[PDB]
Design a protein around this ligand. Structure first.
Ligand SMILES: Nc1ncnc2c1ncn2[C@@H]1O[C@H](COP(=O)(O)OP(=O)(O)OP(=O)(O)O)[C@@H](O)[C@H]1O
Ligand SMILES: Nc1ncnc2c1ncn2[C@@H]1O[C@H](COP(=O)(O)OP(=O)(O)OP(=O)(O)O)[C@@H](O)[C@H]1O
Ligand SMILES: [Mg+2]
Ligand SMILES: [Mg+2]
Lengths: 250, 396, 234, 243, 379
């Protein structure tokens, strides 16, 4: 029938795609999620959007997925759609491995997903995937990288970006404090706790309210570990002792 | 110029002496008249005080008890809203005042005196009567059947009623004009409005939507009461979509108010009511919406479509609007019409304005061939992005 | 307010098809005159800048070495038709071995004209009628013939047709200047006189395309040099 | 599945989807293209960089083939879907015909891919426009431009996308044969044209040249700042014709 | 020159008039002419009497009689008395009846409208063009649609072309539509009516068309007039529940506007200016060429324009020396001249929490960070 058709794959009089534009606004409500590049590895930080006293944790992370041995990504938006896109990624990256018998390059993994996100906006009449992702990765053509895809099907490399709740406020704080080069992984974790603390309206962060996962290179293999609560709790104390010594001017 | 600067001094000051003495020997202001003729009026007003029947308190007859009896009696219903049995007039023949007729009575002994001027009720309806606008039948292009249909059914039967009764027919009453917005449904009616020289009463569709239940229907009722008296009228319901609806039930009385007003309009052009001899124009732009019982012949006998003009029309219409402005020698008006796709007459009005504008913007005194192709680009291409004609054209 | 792609107007004919006709009145002008000497097709390019190459515009295309064509309307939609015409004429040459009658080609192109169909077809059928009218002029065994084919699938033979944004104007000036006893040099000169009134800019050697198809030749488009010679005479 | 008719005829005789996709082009970025005699220069205005992005992933000048490059302006999403199919086509043609693609032919296929999408069920139009640029098998330069409709013309010079009506007005007067007589004069013609519609100076114009039988070089930011100094130097030595 | 050659005859006209009046007063009753007139005028306050009852003229009878409605609503067929301008007797008009005789002594009063005090404005909007930064196309078609035809009505007449009738200003919110409205209200010195598009929806049914009828009438009484309609979207998008019949009643309100904007009733010399930021949701028939003729659009400012705006609000201030205007502009992006003034205003305020007058480079950092959360939060 035609009465009950939404027509989700059709232009506006203005020159937009309304469904892809609304999907953006649905991402402005998900948890904050930022990523910072360094010279000595790269790290994703995301705040746990769902927290509670009864809620449990069973998995190494509730927002960070491992797509390969060398790549992880964080999602933002409709959690249900995120269980779909992260399963196609894993399957893409093994299908690459099954031919060339290498680990897939960082850039290609993304575009290959963005052909699927982009297909849905152009024909078939399904609602688009309402998810944006950050991909931290490592390959042998560019070293560490960071990338960000949209429900449109646009992606870009970044050196430090943010997606989801209060993204524009994070990025304003990164433009100022982030140096081109000159970033060690110790320094990036200082910037990541400071930026996260400013876009979230809680008095202070807690090792049980965020998740910081790094991606380092140690011994020619990639390592992707998620900081325990003790490792993050150190970072939170060293930031309060930089706010106590950020009143020594008066 | 000391001579003529001196002339300018007393050309201001002396004309001011003129006004000064005019006021010294007439004197007017926040006074009700010019005070020049009413000084004698005053001495007729001292005869208006002697006029003791005046003031006369106005009421309405409702019921005649006896008429053949030597002593007619009436039942007057006055405005204090107490009712009196009264005598007949003291001179006016008792044949003149029937029941219903509004009639003025004396206030001391409620003696009926002066028959009226009935149907006061017309207060808003009063203002629908017209005073001839400024457009004629030459200012309209696409003069095909379009305008010759309409004259035939609305203007010719009022100028030459002898040739329709000699043949033995009866010409048709109503005429529906409908077309995409800006194609001369109103223009073609602004036209017939003055040339007709017969009473012309146009109502604006929205002005019959009232506040109180069935006040709208009253409005319509009073409108034809007034038009039946004035022998041979037009009524021109402009843009009827309000009160143009179509019956339908669903939910809680949707449009049940407006809908009922329409039934009254329907009912008075087709009920029993023979009705005098009043023609009726209705110019919608959305005929798809009108109720079938409002649309079928015998209430709206001839439907005139105002389709978008063709090539030949356009060429005609450019001449009708541009002839009035200064244009260089050789304007291919036939090329500005190939260059228009399906355009409204009102799109071409706009083109000519802007060809004038570029000539004004650049400080030249004459629009050239370039100025049109440029202004025809601006007004059609750009502004066509948000045109009515595309979408509004299916409801047509 | 939405309806199907296959709705009849209560009037009596197909909404879309009645519309696709209006898309012609936006297109360039083409004029075809049929003679006993051959067919000529003249169509104005209508360049929009001085920066455009007045040569990568193709509004006369060869269908075979004896069947020309001229498009007016949305020249983008012709791409699909022209290529069906060619592969039609070739298949007819690969089986029956012999040229194809001009009428038969135009019939085979017109069978696609009504073929849209929102559903109950392939995931590949057209969705909307074609936006383009054609002038197939060729020479076969009946001598020269010129056919006109619009987006209604109704094709018909003409002695001289004009289409486009000067269909009304030019068609009336063909009726006064056409007659059976012409030669090809009279026609090419007759059409460019009609085509010079209905254009918007001056008639150069870069503002038209001429082609002819003659019994004793192939389809032969006139180059920028040969055009100078017939605009000199006018 | 989803057999619907997205693009149907207006009653006015247009196609509203292909006319709306025209607006998704106008919300794009300016790109120009002038063709010299041994060199073809297309520049895209705005790298779009925010001092955090890489300049390696925001590029809007891809390369279909070896002699064929293409710049676009519209929805970045759609453009990548066309460019892909174009690169496939550019190799499918080397297999079946020995020569490399000419620049006309890889265009007629990009256009014909965009036309089919405005006349098939389920699909909205591609919301991109394109400058296909290259050299033939004869050293000839070529510059083609497509649009959502799926029409294509050659040009000598051209601009698409945002602010392209203004840039076409500057190239009418400035494209002569007193310019584009050298490789240095043709690059300076492009930059001088984007400087009219960029509001941040020259440090915001990515610019790629292609030269005869060599491959596409993207000019690093240093060379572009050198050329922008020669422009601004030349508007102070026009003070020798005002005195 | 000639104008006094004309005077020399105008005076003689008056001197003659003086002959007649100066002699006929003394022929009347050996007294001044205004003293005889004053004998009569006091005698007319004898006829007139005191008090004077206000009433309603319902209808006129040609016979110089009229049916009026006193306070009670009781109608009276009275007589139209001495010293009355019958051209001030339209239906609905307030009349002065004799408290005792009930005869229209007349409409000797300036009956007032309380709707014109709402619609008209006796403004002096400080913002003139030249305070609108860098939107310059916008600043002109307008002058060609409103201000210029009142200053120089000889250009349009000389060309032979009607001046264009109404404009629509439309664009993203904040860009400067209402700021252009302020500019042209200032200058033209035509009567400037102003009604927001929302005010065209009120509780009781039917008033929609009525308010719309009486808005133009006001603007016609005062011609030459300008009728601006700020945010005409609100008529057709946001609703308020108060109205009955829902969307159908919204339409008939619009259809009234739509008529009395073109219609049949031969109006004249009332410009129209419709602002909006959703233009794509307007009944096309409303913005049909020949109803509204020019659609100025207001795009977000450029970068160099966005700098002239941020340079214009800061001009009344004193900025500390470390303030780089060009770092705060580019810092954010996609600013409306409303957002620019919002960053200027906030920071200047931070300086007033400290009791200074130097907006420092840090006042703008706190500010810019409190208008960005403002734009980021509450979305
Ligand atoms: N055939 C025509 N000849 C000359 N002028 C025309 C013609 N058609 C339209 N116009 C121009 O269009 C203007 C407005 O037309 P008009 O208002 O009568 O259209 P309409 O059918 O009343 O539209 P609406 O539904 O908006 O009331 C006229 O003032 C006139 O100048
Ligand atoms: N281009 C500009 N130049 C100078 N000041 C501007 C500009 N644009 C906006 N402003 C400032 O912003 C203030 C409010 O803007 P304005 O009222 O014009 O917004 P608007 O576009 O009418 O918004 P809305 O869509 O809500 O009506 C103005 O008083 C003015 O000081
Ligand atoms: Mg009308
Ligand atoms: Mg405003």
């Amino acid at each position: 029938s035609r009465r009950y058709d939404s027509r989700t794959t059709i232009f506006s009089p203005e020159g937009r795609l309304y469904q892809v534009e609304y999907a953006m606004e649905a991402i402005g409500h998900a948890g904050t999620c930022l990523g910072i590049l360094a010279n000595d590895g790269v790290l994703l930080a995301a705040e746990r959007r769902n927290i509670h006293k009864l809620l449990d944790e069973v998995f190494f992370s509730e927002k960070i997925y491992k797509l390969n041995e060398d790549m992880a990504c964080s999602v933002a938006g409709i959690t249900s759609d995120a269980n779909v896109l992260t399963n196609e990624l894993r399957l893409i990256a093994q299908r690459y491995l099954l031919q060339y018998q290498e680990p897939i390059p960082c850039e290609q993994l993304v575009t290959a997903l963005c052909d699927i996100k982009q297909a849905y906006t152009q024909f078939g009449g399904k609602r688009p995937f309402g998810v944006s992702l950050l991909y931290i990765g490592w390959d042998k053509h560019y070293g560490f990288q960071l990338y960000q895809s949209d429900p449109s099907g646009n992606y870009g490399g970044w050196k430090a970006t943010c997606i989801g709740n209060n993204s524009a406020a994070a990025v304003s704080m990164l433009k100022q404090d982030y140096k081109e080069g000159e970033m060690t992984l110790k320094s990036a974790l200082a910037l990541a706790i400071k930026v996260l603390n400013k876009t979230m309206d809680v008095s202070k962060l807690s090792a049980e309210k965020v998740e910081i996962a790094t991606l380092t290179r140690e011994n020619g293999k990639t390592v992707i570990r998620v900081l325990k609560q003790k490792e993050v709790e150190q970072l939170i104390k060293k930031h309060e002792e930089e706010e106590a010594k950020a009143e020594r001017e008066k | 110029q000391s001579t003529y600067s001196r002339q300018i001094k007393q050309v201001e000051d002396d004309i001011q002496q003129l006004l000064k003495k005019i006021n010294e020997l007439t004197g007017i202001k926040e006074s009700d008249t010019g005070l020049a003729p009413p000084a004698l009026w005053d001495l007729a007003a001292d005869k208006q005080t002697l006029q003791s029947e005046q003031p006369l308190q106005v009421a309405r007859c409702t019921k005649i008890i006896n008429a053949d009896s030597e002593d007619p009696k009436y039942i007057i219903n006055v405005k204090q809203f107490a009712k009196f049995v009264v005598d007949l007039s003291d001179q006016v023949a008792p044949t003149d005042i029937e029941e219903g007729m509004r009639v003025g009575v004396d206030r001391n002994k409620y003696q009926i005196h002066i028959p009226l001027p009935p149907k006061i009720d017309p207060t808003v309806t009063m203002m629908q009567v017209e005073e001839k606008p400024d457009v004629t039948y030459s200012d309209v292009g696409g003069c095909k059947e379009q305008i010759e249909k309409l004259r035939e059914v609305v203007e010719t039967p009022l100028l030459h009623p002898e040739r329709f009764v000699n043949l033995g027919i009866e010409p048709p009453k109503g005429v529906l004009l409908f077309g995409p917005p800006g194609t001369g449904k109103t223009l073609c009616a602004r036209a017939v409005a003055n040339r007709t020289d017969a009473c012309f009463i146009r109502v604006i569709g929205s002005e019959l939507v009232q506040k109180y239940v069935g006040e709208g229907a009253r409005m319509v009722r009073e409108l034809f009461e007034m038009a039946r008296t004035k022998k041979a009228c037009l009524i021109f319901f402009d843009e009827i979509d309000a009160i143009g609806g179509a019956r339908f039930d669903d939910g809680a009385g949707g449009d049940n108010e407006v809908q009922r007003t329409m039934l009254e309009l329907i009912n008075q052009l087709d009920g029993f009511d023979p009705r005098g001899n009043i023609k009726v124009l209705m110019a919608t732009n959305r005929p798809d919406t009108l109720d079938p019982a409002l649309m079928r012949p015998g209430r709206l006998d001839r439907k005139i479509e105002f389709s978008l003009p063709d090539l030949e029309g356009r060429t005609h219409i450019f001449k009708i609007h541009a002839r009035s402005m200064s244009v260089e020698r050789d304007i291919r008006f036939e090329l500005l019409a190939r260059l228009c796709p399906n355009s409204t007459g009102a799109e071409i009005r706009s083109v000519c304005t802007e060809a004038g504008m570029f000539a004004i913007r650049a400080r030249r005194k004459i629009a050239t061939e370039k100025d049109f192709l440029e202004a025809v680009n601006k007004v059609i291409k750009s502004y066509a992005k948000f045109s009515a004609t595309p979408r509004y054209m299916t409801y047509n | 307010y939405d309806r199907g792609v296959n709705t009849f107007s209560p009037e009596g004919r197909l909404f879309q098809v009645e519309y696709a006709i209006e898309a012609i009145k936006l297109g360039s002008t083409a004029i075809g005159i049929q003679t006993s000497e051959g067919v000529c097709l003249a169509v104005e390019k209508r360049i929009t800048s001085p920066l455009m190459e007045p040569s990568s515009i193709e509004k006369i295309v060869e269908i075979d070495a004896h069947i020309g064509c001229a498009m007016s309307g949305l020249i983008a939609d012709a791409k699909t038709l022209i290529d069906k015409a060619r592969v039609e004429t070739q298949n007819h040459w690969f089986t029956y071995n012999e040229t194809m009658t001009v009428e038969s080609v135009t019939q085979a192109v017109s069978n696609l004209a009504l073929q849209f169909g929102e559903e109950d077809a392939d995931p590949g059928a057209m969705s909307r009628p074609f936006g383009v009218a054609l002038l197939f002029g060729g020479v076969d065994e009946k001598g020269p013939q010129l056919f006109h084919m619009d987006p209604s699938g109704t094709f018909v033979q003409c002695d001289a047709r004009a289409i486009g944004s000067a269909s009304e104007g030019a068609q009336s000036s063909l009726q006064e200047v056409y007659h059976k006893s012409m030669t090809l040099k009279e026609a090419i000169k007759s059409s460019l006189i009609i085509l010079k009134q209905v254009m918007e800019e001056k008639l150069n050697a870069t503002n038209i395309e001429l082609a002819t198809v003659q019994p004793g030749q192939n389809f032969h488009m006139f180059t920028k040099e040969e055009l100078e010679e017939v605009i000199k005479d006018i | 599945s989803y057999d619907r008719a997205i693009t149907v005829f207006s009653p006015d005789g247009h196609l509203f989807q292909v006319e709306y996709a025209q607006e998704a082009v106008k919300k794009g970025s300016t790109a120009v293209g002038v063709r010299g005699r041994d060199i073809v220069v297309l520049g895209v205005e705005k790298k779009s960089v925010a001092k955090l992005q890489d300049e390696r992933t925001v590029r809007k000048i891809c390369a279909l083939d070896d002699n064929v490059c293409m710049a676009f302006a519209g929805l970045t999403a759609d453009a990548r879907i066309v460019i892909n199919r174009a690169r496939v086509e550019c190799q499918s043609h080397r297999l079946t015909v020995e020569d490399p693609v000419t620049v006309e032919y890889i265009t007629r296929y990009i256009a014909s891919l965009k036309q089919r999408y405005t006349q098939s069920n389920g699909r909205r139009p591609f919301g991109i426009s394109a400058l296909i640029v290259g050299f033939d098998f004869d050293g000839t330069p070529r510059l083609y431009q497509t649009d959502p409709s799926g029409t294509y013309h050659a040009w000598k010079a051209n601009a698409i996308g945002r602010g392209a009506k203004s840039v076409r007005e500057f190239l009418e007067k400035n494209y002569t044969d007193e310019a584009i007589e050298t490789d240095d004069l043709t690059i300076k013609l492009v930059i001088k044209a984007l400087l009219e519609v960029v509001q941040s100076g020259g440090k915001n114009i990515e610019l790629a040249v292609m030269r005869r039988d060599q491959s596409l070089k993207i000019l690093n930011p240093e060379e572009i700042e050198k050329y922008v100094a020669e422009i601004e130097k030349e508007k102070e030595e026009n003070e020798k014709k005002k005195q | 020159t000639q104008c006094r050659l004309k005077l020399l005859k105008l005076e003689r006209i008056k001197d003659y008039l003086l002959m007649e009046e100066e002699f006929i007063r003394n022929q009347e009753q050996m007294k001044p002419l205004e003293e005889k007139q004053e004998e009569e005028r006091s005698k007319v306050d004898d006829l007139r009497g005191t008090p004077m009852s206000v009433g309603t003229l319902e209808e006129i009878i040609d016979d110089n009689h009229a049916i009026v409605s006193t306070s009670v609503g009781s109608e009276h067929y009275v007589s139209i008395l001495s010293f009355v301008d019958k051209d001030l007797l339209e239906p609905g008009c307030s009349v002065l009846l004799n408290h005792k005789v009930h005869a229209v002594i007349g409409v000797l009063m300036d009956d007032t409208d309380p709707l014109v005090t709402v619609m008209k404005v006796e403004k002096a909007p400080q913002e003139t063009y030249a305070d609108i930064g860098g939107l310059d196309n916008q600043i002109q078609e307008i002058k060609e649609s409103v201000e210029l035809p009142l200053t120089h009505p000889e250009y349009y007449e000389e060309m032979g072309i009607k001046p264009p009738k109404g404009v629509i200003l439309y664009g993203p919110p904040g860009t400067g539509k209402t700021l252009l409205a302020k500019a042209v209200a200032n200058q033209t010195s035509a009567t400037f009516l102003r009604v927001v598009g929302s005010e065209l929806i009120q509780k009781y049914l039917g008033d929609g068309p009525k308010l719309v009828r009486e808005l133009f009438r006001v603007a016609e009484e005062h011609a030459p007039s300008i009728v601006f309609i700020d945010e005409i979207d609100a008529i057709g998008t946001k609703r308020y529940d108060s109205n009955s019949g829902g969307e159908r009643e919204i339409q008939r309100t619009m259809l009234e506007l739509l008529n009395q904007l073109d219609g049949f009733d031969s109006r004249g010399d009332v410009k129209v200016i419709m602002a909006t930021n959703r233009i794509e949701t307007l009944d096309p028939a409303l913005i049909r060429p020949g109803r509204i003729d020019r659609k100025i659009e207001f795009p977000l400012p450029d970068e160099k324009t966005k700098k002239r705006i941020f340079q214009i609000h800061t001009s009344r201030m004193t900025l500390a020396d470390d303030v780089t205007l060009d770092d705060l502009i580019m810092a954010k992006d996609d600013l409306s001249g409303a957002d620019i003034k919002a960053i200027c205003t906030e920071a200047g305020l931070m300086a007033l929490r400290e009791r200074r007058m130097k907006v420092t480079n840090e006042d703008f950092k706190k500010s810019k960070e409190n208008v960005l959360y403002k734009k980021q939060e509450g979305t």
